[PDB]
Amino acid sequence: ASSINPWILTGFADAEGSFLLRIRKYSQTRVGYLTELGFQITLHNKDKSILENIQSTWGVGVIANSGDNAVSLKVTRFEDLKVIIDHFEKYPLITQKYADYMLFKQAFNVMENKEHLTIEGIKELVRIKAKLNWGLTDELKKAFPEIISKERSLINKNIPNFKWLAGFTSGDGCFFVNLSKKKTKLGVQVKLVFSISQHIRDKNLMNSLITYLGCGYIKKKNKSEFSWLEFVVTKFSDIRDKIIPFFQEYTLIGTKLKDFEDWCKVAKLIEEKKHLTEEGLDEIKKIKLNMNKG
DNA sequence: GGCCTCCACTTATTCGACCTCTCAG
DNA sequence: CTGAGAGGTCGAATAAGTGGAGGCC
Ligand SMILES: [Ca+2]
Ligand SMILES: [Ca+2]
Ligand SMILES: [Ca+2]
Ligand SMILES: [Ca+2]
Ligand SMILES: [Ca+2]
Ligand SMILES: [Ca+2]
Ligand SMILES: [Ca+2]
Ligand SMILES: [Ca+2]
Fold first, then answer.
1. C-alpha A13 – ligand 6 centre gap (Å)
2. Which of A113, A141, A169 is the last residue of a domain?
3. Is A101 strand, coil or helix?
4. Beta carbons of A261 and A172 less than 8 angstroms apart
5. C-alpha R_g of chain A
6. Which nucleotide has the least CA–C1' distance to A17?
7. Which residues of chain A (18-57) touch nucleic strand B at CB < 7 A?
8. Is the CB of A230 under 7 A from strand B?
9. What CATH number is given to the structural domain containing A128?
10. What's the CA A251/C1' B4 distance, rounded, in angstroms?
11. Half-sphere exposure of A194 (CA within 13 A, CB side)
């Protein structure tokens, strides 16, 4: 395998990767609970390469199928979690996931002292799990009532580097060739779109993208209860003089790099105005088709 | 015995990706 | 006519999670 730049790896960990803390009822321990702390990243089968290069970069973690179409990288071996702590202490996360890392860091110290084998240590872990990701199940809520959960700090940090954004984009980014039917002679408009999806927790971070990249805007989407944000750039001059030069200097990792490469091919056709012709339009449809089924 | 670590595989919901239209210059 | 938003839809490569058990000191 090949190494991954640490900042690119952190950025990819802001977009992918989830900390996890298992607190299960268990008959084969005195305290009656089985604990499992770790970190994981789940991608499509086609992107198993990233996991292998991560596994080789950190020298930690195990790979396993995640259903019929996906695979994951899991790090739960306790001694291997030191690498995860060492990496993120030097290359910290900047999304709200950094608050989950801190809770993960606290759980590590409880288990490091072996306090998870006691009833008090478990209670401490439960107070931490209450604020980690999706909190506690009602089964444990009623099991450990009147527990003062730990406080979850609001993360509001600046983008550290451009490499961080390359990794974050590879995880939650998208390079799309928009074909828009138009009641006109040619019939269709071509328009490149660069976007980054993200939960509305990080509205601050998302908004700062406009300031950091000097272009784009924000779009608030809602699916009933749930809402998230999209950082979107469509103005071609910005895509040509900002987005494209940026990601040529700071390589994307995974299958998204292939989409970026075809994306840039369409940008070339557009610079030459070949997107107003007919032969050029067949070319753009071929490139776009190669990005959907590919 | 007591406890750790891994594979199988799912759920909820947060992404990615896919549209189509208005309208000013 | 064209470009740049405006205004969306939608399915799971979503982010997060669980059951089962082989493995080790
Ligand atoms: Ca993400
Ligand atoms: Ca994922
Ligand atoms: Ca190792
Ligand atoms: Ca394996
Ligand atoms: Ca492991
Ligand atoms: Ca260190
Ligand atoms: Ca992704
Ligand atoms: Ca332009």
1. 18
2. A141
3. helix
4. no
5. 22
6. C15
7. 28-31, 34-36, 42
8. yes
9. 3.10.28.10
10. 39
11. 27
Cβ atoms within 10 Å, residue A73:
24
**Structure's resolution in angstroms:** 2.5
**C-alpha A108: how far from chain center:** 23
Judging by DSSP bridges, how do beta strands A188-199 and A217-223 pair with one another?
unpaired
Across the beta sheet with A173-181, the strand order is A173-181, A188-199, A226-233, A217-223
- What does each C-alpha distance from A38 to A57, A64, A74, A281 come to in angstroms? 17, 15, 7, 49
Which two three-digit tokens encode residue A60?
Answer: 């930690």
The approach used to solve this structure was X-ray
Indicate if A38 and A81 belong to the same structural domain: yes
Question: Where in the sequence is the domain holding A243, given as residue range(s)?
Answer: 148-294
Q: Which residue has tokens 């700062």?
A: A208
Chain C: bases < 7 Å from a protein Cβ: 1-19, 21
- Count structural domains, chain A: 2
Structure token pair of residue A210: 């406009």
CB atoms within 10 A of CB A138: 8
**CB-based contact A183:A208 (threshold 8 Å):** no
Length of chain A: 294
Q: Measure A100 CA to C22 C1' (Å).
A: 30
**Helical packing angle, A48-58 and A6-15, nearest 10°:** 130
Distance CA A103, CA A87 (A): 16
Tokens of residue A54, six digits: 């991560």
